[PDB]
């Protein structure tokens, strides 16, 4: 898509158990805790991180590689979302996301969450946002960009932020990073 965006991970929002590659295009769940200003932005309870980019308007496309991963979380969220404390990832909270959990279960963050039927387990996900349209949509790059799920009527007011999680590593076998694909 010509609507493509080059997204850089924002280390200030990064949960402190996370590791970003030096070019801030990779993120993996570590096995200890970096010591960094426990600031207002940092996701504190969950392995979560936003992009440096704020979308106030327009259409914006990007892709993420999920090859070899048993869980993950991807989408857009309001700048205003809460960073500290426990919370349900959901549109009801200002997150427009889909996830793999414990592998073998793809779901959209509606309230309550919605199980997806997928023909092809993705190694690559496309994320698209039409602001003025109130659209966020997820495509299965591996299955000829088939629509996974789509949130409509989102009616956005704030600035918006891309959002990721490499998931949790309960298994020891969800260590592979998420990767932002060059485009």
Ligand X SMILES: CNC(=O)[C@H](Cc1ccncc1)NC(=O)[C@@H]1C[C@@H](C2CCCCC2)CN1C(=O)C[C@H](N)c1ccccc1OCCOCCO
93, 158 Cβ separation under 8 angstroms? no
Among 88, 120, 123, 183, binds ligand X (CB under 6 A): 88
Does residue 99 bind ligand X (CB under 6 A)?
Answer: yes
Does residue 120 bind ligand X (CB under 6 A)?
Answer: no
Among 1, 17, 61, 87, binds ligand X (CB under 6 A): 87
Segment near ligand X (CB under 6 A); pick from 34-42, 122-130, 150-158, 163-171: 163-171
Residue 38, Cβ density class (10 Å: 0-12 exposed, 13-18 middle, ≥19 buried)? exposed
**One character per residue 1-40, x = contact with ligand X (rule: CB under 6 A):** ----------------------------------------
Task: Kindly state the smallest distance separating residue 71's Cβ from ligand X, in Å.
Answer: 6
Among 13, 15, 165, 179, binds ligand X (CB under 6 A): 165
Does residue 94 bind ligand X (CB under 6 A)?
Answer: no
Instruction: Name which of residues 42 to 81 contact ligand X (CB under 6 A).
Output: 46-47, 73
Among 86, 115, 153, 157, binds ligand X (CB under 6 A): 86
Q: Which CB atom, from 57 or from 67, has the smaller least distance to ligand X?
A: 67
Residues in the chain: 183
Task: Quote the DSSP letter at residue 177.
Answer: P
118, 107 Cβ separation under 8 angstroms? no
What is the DSSP secondary-structure string of 49-112? EEBS--BSSSEEEEEEE-TT-S-EEEEEEETTS--SS----SGGGTEEEEEE-SSS-EEE--SS
Q: CA nearest 162: which of 6, 51, 49?
A: 51
The token pair that represents 33 in the structure block: 């805790």
Binding site for ligand X (CB under 6 A): 46-47, 73, 86-89, 99, 101, 113, 165, 167-168
């Amino acid at each position: 898509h010509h609507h493509m965006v080059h997204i850089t991970l924002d280390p200030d929002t990064a949960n402190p158990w996370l590791i970003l590659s030096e070019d801030r295009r990779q993120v993996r769940l570590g096995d200890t805790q970096q010591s960094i200003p426990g600031n207002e932005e940092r996701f504190d309870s969950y392995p979560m991180v936003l992009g440096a980019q704020h979308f106030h308007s327009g259409k914006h496309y990007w892709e993420v590689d999920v090859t070899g991963k048993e869980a993950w979380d991807l989408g857009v969220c309001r700048d205003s979302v809460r960073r500290k404390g426990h919370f349900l990832l959901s549109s009801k909270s200002g997150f427009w996301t889909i996830w793999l959990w414990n592998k073998q279960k793809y779901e959209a963050g509606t309230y309550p969450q919605t199980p997806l039927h997928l023909q092809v387990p993705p190694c690559q996900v496309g994320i698209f946002l039409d602001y003025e349209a109130g659209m966020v949509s997820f495509y299965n790059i591996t299955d000829h960009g088939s629509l996974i799920y789509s949130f409509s009527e989102c009616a956005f007011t704030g600035p918006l932020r891309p959002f990721f999680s490499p998931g949790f590593n309960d298994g020891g076998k969800n260590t592979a990073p998420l990767t932002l694909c060059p485009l």
